């Protein structure tokens, strides 16, 4: 039987695909992540800060 790739197939989303967490995903640190300043961060007073000298 034709063992080739069957170029005419269904190129779509396959909606009934496993919609779960993929336990084997890369558990590492992702070095290529946004190293910037996070301009939208908590600008408040941080009440739990060092209350000593």
């Amino acid at each position, epitope marked *: 039987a034709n063992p080739n790739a069957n170029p005419n197939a269904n190129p779509n989303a396959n909606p009934n695909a496993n919609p779960n967490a993929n336990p084997n995903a890369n558990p590492n640190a992702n070095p290529n992540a*946004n190293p*910037n300043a996070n301009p*939208n961060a908590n*600008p*408040n007073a941080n009440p739990n800060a060092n209350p000593n000298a």
Partner: antibody, heavy 122, light 107 residues
């Protein structure tokens, strides 16, 4: 808990104007505040943020280098020194206090001032 | 992050049910807020983090959503609830932006 501003008025383009924002009823030194514009015919637009001590500030891309936000924790007062005003810059300016959040991602603007009028024309 | 609110004007009567829809051009997670500005005053917070209620707000106001579709639901419109409502987003690395604002008028 009250937030009252002043220092508005009408000036010609190219001049400098200084707004103020006096806070009362709460520890003003604990809060990073914002300035927010309201131009009629358009929704609110963010202007500047001050990071509770003066370490960090961030401005809207259209006011970078012309608006200088600053604060004075000893008098409970903000300062937005405006330089080189254009006819675009006419709107109502509001102070905004960032709500206390139990995280690191900030929160919405809970306390707002009554707004002041800054009009520019020839 | 362009924020759009629809419908721009929503006529309703006292005791009706009003839903205002806020759509974000990009995913803003659950960081979103709703305001209410009566004419001549300063806006006051109603909902923060897109679900929680600000202290002292009536229990009528409620909101839900995450990602790009956010709605605000008023169970029973009141005669002091006729004001302009604004949608704000503060994503992680995005700055604060506001929607155009819908005005709820008396039918």
């Amino acid at each position: 808990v009250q937030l009252v501003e002043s220092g508005g008025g009408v000036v010609q383009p190219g001049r400098s104007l200084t707004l103020s924002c006096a806070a009362s009823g709460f520890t003003f030194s604990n809060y990073g505040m914002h300035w927010v514009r309201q131009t009629p015919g358009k929704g609110l637009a963010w202007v500047a943020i001050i990071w509770y001590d003066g370490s960090k500030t961030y401005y809207e891309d259209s006011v970078k280098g012309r608006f200088t936000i600053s604060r004075d924790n000893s008098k409970n007062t903000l300062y937005l020194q405006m330089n080189s005003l254009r006819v675009d810059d006419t709107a109502v300016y509001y102070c905004a206090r960032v709500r206390h959040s139990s995280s690191r991602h900030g929160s919405a603007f809970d306390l707002w001032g009554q707004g002041t009028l800054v009009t520019v024309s020839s | 992050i362009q924020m759009t609110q629809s419908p721009s004007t929503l006529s309703a009567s006292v005791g009706d049910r009003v839903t205002i829809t806020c759509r974000a051009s990009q995913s803003v997670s659950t960081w979103l807020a709703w305001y209410q500005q009566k004419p001549g005053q300063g806006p006051k917070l109603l909902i923060y983090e897109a679900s929680s209620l600000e202290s002292g707000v009536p229990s009528r106001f409620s909101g839900s959503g995450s990602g790009t579709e956010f709605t605000l639901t008023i169970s029973s419109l009141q005669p002091d609830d006729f004001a302009t409502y604004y949608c704000q987003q503060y994503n992680s690395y995005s700055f604060w932006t506001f929607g155009q604002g819908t005005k709820v008028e008396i039918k």
